[model samples]
Structures are given as structure tokens and as C-alpha cells.
Target: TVLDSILEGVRADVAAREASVSLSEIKAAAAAAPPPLDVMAALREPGIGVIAEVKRASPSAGALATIADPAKLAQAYQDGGARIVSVVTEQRRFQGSLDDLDAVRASVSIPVLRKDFVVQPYQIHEARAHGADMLLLIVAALEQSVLVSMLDRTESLGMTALVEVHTEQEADRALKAGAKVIGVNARDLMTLDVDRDCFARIAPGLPSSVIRIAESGVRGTADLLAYAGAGADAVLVGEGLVTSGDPRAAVADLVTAG
Candidate 1:
């Protein structure tokens, strides 16, 4: 599966980083990092919240754009009324780095999500050290025990976890794992094929207490409205906004669509 290969690369990267940076040092940094913004409050606002992404490339889409200045792009999103900024820090396939997260964090006051194939607790600490207010935990990539442990770690560090699911079973597991925020991603990790109906099919099963996020396959306002109608409190947009000429306007359009 594509996820297996991605995790292999992620583990290798984490190992190399761990050799130089001790876990205690990372933990200290995480403890000293500033408090996180209220992501839930932002998402629960009257209009549909937008989590604009700073994505450079992807395995399925290849090179999307050459984001010369990630901070500038993040500021644009904030100006356009984005509730959160998602930074894809997977260096191998996504061509992203923690520096991108740092830049975005410094530029925007909104919450920043470290979007990566997080397999170890060290990576979660690394994310907090780098100023990530939230991080992704993909249900397809972790065992249930590991998933619950990681979620606990995120909360311990005063961070939020966006538990991602692509199927009904994964959704069930997310709820069972006690996920506060659930993102129903359209793209399947195993095959990388996108099913546009994934969010609508899975989101309705989630309780109203859990924030429902629609991830991927958002092309325009119509798609945003469709997800909003399907019970999405927020939408995580990547390729569409990054590839668009004016991301600020694109975000403004989507936010107004709610």
C-alpha cells in the first residue's frame, strides 16, 4: 500500500532526526512553546471554517506549486478568514519541512496543524516544539492502541489531534478512540483514489459533539456548500487553494459560501 511506503520513509526520517535531537530536549521545547489557539471555537463559528493548506507536492498529484514563501501564503489565508493553517511537513513525497510550519506559525495567529505520517511519540513532541497547535493521526496508518496512545500524547502536550478516516470502519475506530475532531478524507491512503462521497457517507455517523471536517476534493464553492450541507463544520483544502492564482480570494469565496 502507498501508506506503508510512506510510513517507511517517515520512520527513516524520524530515526535520523532523533539521533541529533534528544526527546527530552524536544519535550522541554514543547513545554516552553506558547499556548495554542482555540481551534474548536474557531471551527464552531457560525460560518463554515476553512483550514487552508500550504502544500508543495503530493504522491498522487505530483508537484502542485512552488511555494516560495509559506509565511506569506499563510498570512493570505488568515486575511481571507481561515480558521486554521495546515502545513504538510512530509519531506519525502510532499517536499515539506518543519521550517514551513515555523514560518506559517510565525505569520499566522490561527492554529497550525502538522500534517504528516506521524508514527512515533517523538514526532508529536517534535511538532509541538516546532509550534504546531494540532497534528494529524491517520486511522489507516496506526493500530488502535497506538492511535489512542498518540491521541493521549497530543492532549498531554496541550494540542489537538485531527483523526482522519476514509471508510466507515475507520470512522467507527476514530469514535471508539475518543477523537474530538474527525476529518473524513476523500482520498484513500491504500489506493490513493478519491471517492467524493466519502465525507457525506461517514460524517453523518459522527456525533455532533465531534467537530466534522471534510478533507480533499474541494474544487470550488459548490463543493464547499455540498460538504456544508452534508454536516461539515470545516473543510481542509490543499491542492485547490495552492494551485489557485489567488489563494486569499479562493479562501474568502469558500468562507462566504457557508
Candidate 2:
């Protein structure tokens, strides 16, 4: 499966980083970093929020854009009224890195989410040290106990976790793990298949207190509107915005649509 291959690469990368950088050192850096912004508050604003992504490539989409300057792209997102900036730091197939996260975090005042296949607690501290206000926790990739423990670690570090799910079962697991912010991804990690109605099917069952986010399958204002109508407080867009001729204007169009 695509997810298994991706995780294999992720584990190797984690091992390499752990060998070069100690957990205590990363924790020290995280402790020294300033407090993260309130992402929940940002998403809870009046209208549907846009989580513009700084993505270079993806397994399903291949190479979307070159993204020469991630910081510039993030600033454009903020200027275009994006509520949050998501930097995909998965290196293998996604072609992203922590340096991109650092660049985006330094450039934007909006909350930055470190989008990656996080499997260990060390990666959480690594994200904090890079100045990320939030991180992704995919339900398909973790067991219930590990998911719950990681959620606790994220809260203790003063950072938010965007718990991502694909199916109704995963959504239930996210809720059981005490996830406050849940993202319904249309794309299945294992097969890279996208179900456009995935969010609509699962969102109605989620508690109102949770921040509902629709991920993937958004190409324009119409798609964004569809998600908003489906009860999405936020939409995570990547390929559409990155591949658009003008990302800022594209974001503005969606922001105004909502």
C-alpha cells in the first residue's frame, strides 16, 4: 500500500534524525520557543477558514509546483486571508522538509501546521523547535493508545494536533482519542483513492465542539463552497492553490466564497 511505503520511508528518516539530534536537545529548543498561537480560535472565526498549504509534491499528484520560496508563498496565503498555513514536511514522496516549515513559520503571523506522517513523540518536539503551532496526526497510521498518548503530548507542549481521518471508523477513533480538531481527508492513504463525499458522510456525526476540516479534492470556489455546506469550518487545500497561476487570488476567491 502507498501508506505502508510512505511510513517505511518516514521511519528511516526519523531514525536518521534521532541519531544526529538528541531528544533532550530538541525538547530544550521547544521549551525555548515562544508559545503557539490559538489555532482553534483562528478556525472558530466568522466564516469558513482556509488552511493554505506549502506543498511541493504528493504521491497521488506527483510534482505540483517547484515552490522556490516557501516563505513567500506562505505570506501570500496570509495576505489572501488564509486562517492557517500548512507546511508539508514529509520528504520522501511529498518532497518537503522542516526547513520549509521554518521558513513558512518565520514569514507568516498566522498559525503554521506541520503536515507530516508523525509516528513518534520526538517528531512533535521537532515540530515545536521549528516553530510550528500545530501538527498532523493521521488516525490510519496509529493505534488507539499511541494516538491518545501523542494527543496528550501535543497538548502538554502547548501545540494543537489536527487529527486526520479517512473513513467513519477512523473518525470514531479520532473522537475516542479525544481529538478536538478533526480533518476528514477524501484521499485514502493506502490506495491514494479520493472519495469526494467522504467529509459529508462523516462530518454530521462529529461533535459540534470539534473543529471540522475538509481535506483534499478541493479545486476551486465551488468545491470549497461544497465543503462549507457540508459543515467544514476549514478546508485544507494543496494542489489547487499551489498549481494555480496566482495562489493569492485563488485563496481570496475561496475566502470570499465562504
- 255: Cα error in model 1, Å: 0.9
Candidate 1 lDDT, tens digit per residue, 63-135?
Answer: 9999999999999999888889999999999999999999999999999999999999999999999999989
Error of 1 at 128 (Å): 0.7
Candidate 2's C-alpha runs over 4 A off are none
Clashes of 2: 0
Worst 10 residues of 1 by lDDT: 35-44
User: Which stretch of 10 consecutive residues in model 2 shows the poorest summed lDDT?
Assistant: 249-258
Question: Can you tell me which runs of candidate 1 are displaced by over 4 Å?
Answer: none
TM-score of every candidate: 0.98, 0.98
